[PDB]
Design an enzyme around this catalytic site. Sequence first.
Site, PDB file in Angstrom:
ATOM      1  N   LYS B  50       0.926  -1.095   0.139  1.00  0.00           N
ATOM      2  CA  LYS B  50       0.111   0.105  -0.102  1.00  0.00           C
ATOM      3  C   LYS B  50       0.973   1.314  -0.123  1.00  0.00           C
ATOM      4  O   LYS B  50       0.472   2.435  -0.237  1.00  0.00           O
ATOM      5  CB  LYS B  50      -1.029  -0.001   1.128  1.00  0.00           C
ATOM      6  CG  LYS B  50      -1.829  -1.219   1.509  1.00  0.00           C
ATOM      7  CD  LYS B  50      -2.608  -1.317   2.969  1.00  0.00           C
ATOM      8  CE  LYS B  50      -1.686  -1.375   4.079  1.00  0.00           C
ATOM      9  NZ  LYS B  50      -1.013  -2.506   4.765  1.00  0.00           N
ATOM     10  N   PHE B  91      13.257  -5.249   3.600  1.00  0.00           N
ATOM     11  CA  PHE B  91      14.218  -5.691   4.434  1.00  0.00           C
ATOM     12  C   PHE B  91      13.805  -6.686   5.627  1.00  0.00           C
ATOM     13  O   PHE B  91      14.223  -7.746   5.869  1.00  0.00           O
ATOM     14  CB  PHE B  91      15.427  -4.663   4.862  1.00  0.00           C
ATOM     15  CG  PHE B  91      16.276  -5.270   6.090  1.00  0.00           C
ATOM     16  CD1 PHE B  91      17.132  -6.090   5.923  1.00  0.00           C
ATOM     17  CD2 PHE B  91      16.235  -4.370   7.171  1.00  0.00           C
ATOM     18  CE1 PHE B  91      17.986  -6.724   7.080  1.00  0.00           C
ATOM     19  CE2 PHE B  91      17.111  -4.576   8.208  1.00  0.00           C
ATOM     20  CZ  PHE B  91      18.052  -5.759   8.216  1.00  0.00           C
ATOM     21  N   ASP B  96      11.442 -11.672   7.963  1.00  0.00           N
ATOM     22  CA  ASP B  96      10.659 -12.244   8.668  1.00  0.00           C
ATOM     23  C   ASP B  96       9.790 -13.434   8.308  1.00  0.00           C
ATOM     24  O   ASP B  96       9.304 -14.323   9.029  1.00  0.00           O
ATOM     25  CB  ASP B  96       9.622 -11.024   8.897  1.00  0.00           C
ATOM     26  CG  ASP B  96       8.452 -11.396  10.174  1.00  0.00           C
ATOM     27  OD1 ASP B  96       7.283 -11.812   9.504  1.00  0.00           O
ATOM     28  OD2 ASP B  96       8.480 -11.758  11.150  1.00  0.00           O
ATOM     29  N   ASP B 100       9.156 -16.804  10.225  1.00  0.00           N
ATOM     30  CA  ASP B 100       7.978 -17.135  10.266  1.00  0.00           C
ATOM     31  C   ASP B 100       7.362 -18.153   9.426  1.00  0.00           C
ATOM     32  O   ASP B 100       6.183 -18.762   9.579  1.00  0.00           O
ATOM     33  CB  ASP B 100       6.659 -15.942  10.106  1.00  0.00           C
ATOM     34  CG  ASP B 100       6.863 -14.911  11.378  1.00  0.00           C
ATOM     35  OD1 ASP B 100       7.686 -15.343  12.400  1.00  0.00           O
ATOM     36  OD2 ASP B 100       6.735 -13.686  11.588  1.00  0.00           O
ATOM     37  N   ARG B 105       3.091 -13.405   0.618  1.00  0.00           N
ATOM     38  CA  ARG B 105       3.099 -11.813   1.114  1.00  0.00           C
ATOM     39  C   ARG B 105       2.663 -11.071   0.094  1.00  0.00           C
ATOM     40  O   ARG B 105       3.189 -10.962  -1.448  1.00  0.00           O
ATOM     41  CB  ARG B 105       4.580 -11.613   1.433  1.00  0.00           C
ATOM     42  CG  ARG B 105       4.958 -10.032   1.658  1.00  0.00           C
ATOM     43  CD  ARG B 105       4.443  -9.617   2.972  1.00  0.00           C
ATOM     44  NE  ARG B 105       4.957 -10.275   3.920  1.00  0.00           N
ATOM     45  CZ  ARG B 105       4.802 -10.014   5.401  1.00  0.00           C
ATOM     46  NH1 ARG B 105       3.981  -8.881   5.632  1.00  0.00           N
ATOM     47  NH2 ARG B 105       5.306 -10.701   6.215  1.00  0.00           N
ATOM     48  N   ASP B 167       9.447 -11.005  19.978  1.00  0.00           N
ATOM     49  CA  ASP B 167       8.677 -11.910  19.330  1.00  0.00           C
ATOM     50  C   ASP B 167       9.111 -13.247  19.054  1.00  0.00           C
ATOM     51  O   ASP B 167       8.340 -14.372  19.554  1.00  0.00           O
ATOM     52  CB  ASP B 167       8.460 -11.406  17.831  1.00  0.00           C
ATOM     53  CG  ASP B 167       7.472 -11.915  16.971  1.00  0.00           C
ATOM     54  OD1 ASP B 167       6.380 -11.585  16.627  1.00  0.00           O
ATOM     55  OD2 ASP B 167       7.748 -12.795  16.656  1.00  0.00           O
ATOM     56  N   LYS B 193       8.771  -4.061  18.005  1.00  0.00           N
ATOM     57  CA  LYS B 193       8.658  -4.855  16.477  1.00  0.00           C
ATOM     58  C   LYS B 193       8.094  -3.967  15.247  1.00  0.00           C
ATOM     59  O   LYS B 193       8.426  -3.992  14.102  1.00  0.00           O
ATOM     60  CB  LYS B 193       8.343  -6.151  16.600  1.00  0.00           C
ATOM     61  CG  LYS B 193       6.778  -6.521  16.600  1.00  0.00           C
ATOM     62  CD  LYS B 193       6.621  -7.821  16.038  1.00  0.00           C
ATOM     63  CE  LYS B 193       5.318  -8.289  16.435  1.00  0.00           C
ATOM     64  NZ  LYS B 193       4.380  -9.382  15.979  1.00  0.00           N
ATOM     65  N   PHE B 232      -2.001  -0.733  15.425  1.00  0.00           N
ATOM     66  CA  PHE B 232      -1.977  -1.166  14.158  1.00  0.00           C
ATOM     67  C   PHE B 232      -1.320  -2.458  14.327  1.00  0.00           C
ATOM     68  O   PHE B 232      -1.815  -3.603  13.471  1.00  0.00           O
ATOM     69  CB  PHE B 232      -1.003  -0.510  13.479  1.00  0.00           C
ATOM     70  CG  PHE B 232      -0.570  -0.818  11.825  1.00  0.00           C
ATOM     71  CD1 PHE B 232       0.551  -1.781  11.628  1.00  0.00           C
ATOM     72  CD2 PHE B 232      -1.306  -0.469  10.890  1.00  0.00           C
ATOM     73  CE1 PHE B 232       0.753  -2.323  10.300  1.00  0.00           C
ATOM     74  CE2 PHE B 232      -1.097  -0.910   9.213  1.00  0.00           C
ATOM     75  CZ  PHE B 232      -0.066  -1.845   9.363  1.00  0.00           C
ATOM     76  N   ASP B 236      -3.071  -6.323  12.921  1.00  0.00           N
ATOM     77  CA  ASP B 236      -2.425  -7.067  11.911  1.00  0.00           C
ATOM     78  C   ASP B 236      -2.742  -8.609  12.507  1.00  0.00           C
ATOM     79  O   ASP B 236      -2.858  -9.642  11.681  1.00  0.00           O
ATOM     80  CB  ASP B 236      -0.848  -7.048  12.067  1.00  0.00           C
ATOM     81  CG  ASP B 236      -0.129  -7.979  11.308  1.00  0.00           C
ATOM     82  OD1 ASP B 236      -0.160  -7.834   9.877  1.00  0.00           O
ATOM     83  OD2 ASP B 236       0.296  -8.874  11.700  1.00  0.00           O
ATOM     84  N   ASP B 237      -2.508  -8.775  13.981  1.00  0.00           N
ATOM     85  CA  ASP B 237      -2.926 -10.042  14.628  1.00  0.00           C
ATOM     86  C   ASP B 237      -4.193 -10.544  14.322  1.00  0.00           C
ATOM     87  O   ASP B 237      -4.504 -11.569  14.069  1.00  0.00           O
ATOM     88  CB  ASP B 237      -2.474  -9.951  16.349  1.00  0.00           C
ATOM     89  CG  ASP B 237      -1.138  -9.649  16.493  1.00  0.00           C
ATOM     90  OD1 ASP B 237      -0.289  -9.508  15.727  1.00  0.00           O
ATOM     91  OD2 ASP B 237      -0.878  -9.346  17.548  1.00  0.00           O
TER      92      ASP B 237
HETATM   93  C1  4GA Z   1      11.144  -7.816  11.513  1.00  0.00           C
HETATM   94  C2  4GA Z   1      10.093  -6.674  11.594  1.00  0.00           C
HETATM   95  C3  4GA Z   1       9.197  -7.103  12.484  1.00  0.00           C
HETATM   96  C4  4GA Z   1       7.798  -6.411  12.272  1.00  0.00           C
HETATM   97  N1  4GA Z   1       7.106  -7.170  11.737  1.00  0.00           N
HETATM   98  C5  4GA Z   1       7.361  -7.979  10.851  1.00  0.00           C
HETATM   99  C6  4GA Z   1       6.088  -8.466  10.300  1.00  0.00           C
HETATM  100  N2  4GA Z   1       5.127  -7.706  10.962  1.00  0.00           N
HETATM  101  C7  4GA Z   1       3.809  -7.879  10.671  1.00  0.00           C
HETATM  102  C8  4GA Z   1       3.586  -9.184  10.915  1.00  0.00           C
HETATM  103  O1  4GA Z   1       2.294  -8.961  11.414  1.00  0.00           O
HETATM  104  P1  4GA Z   1       4.371 -10.235  12.104  1.00  0.00           P
HETATM  105  O2  4GA Z   1       5.467 -11.862  11.621  1.00  0.00           O
HETATM  106  O3  4GA Z   1       3.023 -10.999  12.449  1.00  0.00           O
HETATM  107  O4  4GA Z   1       5.253  -9.327  13.303  1.00  0.00           O
HETATM  108  P2  4GA Z   1       3.492 -10.013   9.380  1.00  0.00           P
HETATM  109  O5  4GA Z   1       1.917 -10.250   9.422  1.00  0.00           O
HETATM  110  O6  4GA Z   1       4.169 -11.532   9.092  1.00  0.00           O
HETATM  111  O7  4GA Z   1       3.476  -9.154   7.868  1.00  0.00           O
HETATM  112  C9  4GA Z   1       5.724  -6.788  11.637  1.00  0.00           C
HETATM  113 MG    MG Z   2       5.414 -12.479   9.900  1.00  0.00          MG
HETATM  114 MG    MG Z   3       7.133 -11.898  12.492  1.00  0.00          MG
HETATM  115 MG    MG Z   4       1.454 -10.992  11.455  1.00  0.00          MG
END
Ligand code: 4GA
Ligand code: MG
Ligand code: MG
Ligand code: MG
Lengths: 346, 346
Positions: B50, B91, B96, B100, B105, B167, B193, B232, B236-237
Amino acid sequence: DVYAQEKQDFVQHFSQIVRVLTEDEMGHPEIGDAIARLKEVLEYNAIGGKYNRGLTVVVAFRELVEPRKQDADSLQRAWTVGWCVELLQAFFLVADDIMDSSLTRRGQICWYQKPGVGLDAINDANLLEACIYRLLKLYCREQPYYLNLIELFLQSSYQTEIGQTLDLLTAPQGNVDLVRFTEKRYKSIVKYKTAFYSFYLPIAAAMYMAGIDGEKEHANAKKILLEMGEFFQIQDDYLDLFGDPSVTGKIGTDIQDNKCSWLVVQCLQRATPEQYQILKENYGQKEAEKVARVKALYEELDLPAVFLQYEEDSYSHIMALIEQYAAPLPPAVFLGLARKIYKRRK
Amino acid sequence: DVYAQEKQDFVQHFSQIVRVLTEDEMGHPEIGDAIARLKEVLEYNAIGGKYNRGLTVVVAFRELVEPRKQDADSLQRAWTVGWCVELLQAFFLVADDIMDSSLTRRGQICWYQKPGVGLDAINDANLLEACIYRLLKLYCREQPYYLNLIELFLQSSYQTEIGQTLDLLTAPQGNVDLVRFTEKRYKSIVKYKTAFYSFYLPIAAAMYMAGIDGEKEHANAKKILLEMGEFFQIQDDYLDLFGDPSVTGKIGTDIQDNKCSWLVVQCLQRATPEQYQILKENYGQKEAEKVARVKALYEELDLPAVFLQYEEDSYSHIMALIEQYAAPLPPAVFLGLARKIYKRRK
Ligand SMILES: CCCCn1cc[n+](CC(O)(P(=O)(O)O)P(=O)(O)O)c1
Ligand SMILES: [Mg+2]
Ligand SMILES: [Mg+2]
Ligand SMILES: [Mg+2]
Ligand SMILES: CCCCn1cc[n+](CC(O)(P(=O)(O)O)P(=O)(O)O)c1
Ligand SMILES: [Mg+2]
Ligand SMILES: [Mg+2]
Ligand SMILES: [Mg+2]
């Protein structure tokens, strides 16, 4: 001798690096567990090597700064900048061990291979890189060379990532193509991946700390140091296969990872087209039999003897380069570093 | 409306970012193949989102700099700093997604999941981080805010890596311990984070570009922006489980990765000790049946209704914070950003 005498003081002063990085963020107790993870990452990954690169910062600082200006404080700064180079190193190795699928480093299992670590090591590597700039700020923020130091560490990491991309692009796994392993490709990889951060970075940090910031002097120093880095990487390639892993502290992977090693370039340049095909069939594959077939081709072509001849000619050439380019810097600065890397077995 | 009107110009000017990063290193043809890998990494990983965070830099720059000082050149700088925030983002996401174990994505497979990519993505992520500082140097080297900008991007990446460590430490795989998923732990994770780089970083870059560099004004802005970042991340959660992945562009993993999600904290706070055990048996595990059992517990406890109540109260609170802390900055700067994130479904 010069490296060996400063070692002790340099190593002892790692406790302080660890304290300054843990203490100055306990006005923030919610991150406590992260801080402890940091300490554990520092202790496992910045400790246990030879410290050549960081020691270089400290040695060349003594040799270039006038002793009237070696006050207790500017010394403390010197061994901090030294440690920043050790932290750049730690950052690249941790990531590199993942990308290389390696097994050991410096006598222990690789970080990522530790139970309960795995790919979390990626963020651990990025944190080690972060520490460098925190240090620079904590110790050097009010020094006139501060911004020179920041730009140097950043520029040196970009060059080394460009060299890593080349290292990886030239070694796609499961994809034997011996055509791409040339001398020109090889020299390009090693210049970027190893030479700027192992050799230019440390002397240059020390130059900027001594007020020596001229373009022309930096270029002259660079001319010597990049050729030294090239040799040093050709040495690392040789040790991957023929060094003894109780000295090197690491098991070799270059044949299995399909790498543009110096060895395979020298091989390709001497091989009968029958030898070529044996290389082709056996290279870049996980099977021990097949690695041993490559190793045996290399010994059949006297690659160990050729490595020892190259070591000598490279050394005479580096020495010629010092005679041409060292002035107005004391040659001891280049000579001391060349002594420490000449005929290393780790 | 304000975001939607600047979008086009901001996006079009990505070709130029790509050219300036590829062109100014072709006086070095030996790295050509690396440069091409760079372009491919930029195009796959900085495009298709976005652009909220980078657009924020550009929007707040218009709103804070006097139009007599919005010369074509300082505008060009503005959308470059914007793109630097998009590159920080790129980055962190690439790394991530590996940590994860994610699948998609932004509508496509994750970079690391692409055939022939894998863990080489680690060095690709580190190169994207390098580009930020190359840009800052290329466009902003002679500006009085240059060093403020460098220290801000570095400080913001360290905080976000500290938050990532939290995290990860709070989510060891194969290790269900519901005791550690508290409100206080949760707030700490999300502050580090997500909140500093998604919300403080962009407005503050724009502050420093407009000459607004006071400690006290930076702290007041931070007070608003960190609470917005918290909301925010809670958003996302919620979307990880209940958003529609054709809107979000990503499949959820939080239950399988054993995560200190907002959802599991709210769950734990309402659960009968019978519900507790169902959570315990089924959480942090790869089996679809078992994820569906957790999802069903969450719906049984009206977690969707509780999310919508929290969204409203959080929004009223953020608005109260703006009334307290926005001055002397125009409230439009905070209001415009709150509008763009209020009731997003991606
Ligand atoms: C390294 C940067 C840490 C901050 N970061 C990374 C990814 N996200 C949003 C997520 O919510 P996360 O894995 O859930 O925290 P995503 O849904 O995967 O986009 C924030
Ligand atoms: Mg993630
Ligand atoms: Mg993560
Ligand atoms: Mg997430
Ligand atoms: C990211 C930094 C790239 C430079 N780099 C990384 C590792 N090494 C030395 C090795 O020789 P490589 O894997 O062979 O190049 P190692 O034997 O693994 O220590 C240099
Ligand atoms: Mg390696
Ligand atoms: Mg390597
Ligand atoms: Mg090696």
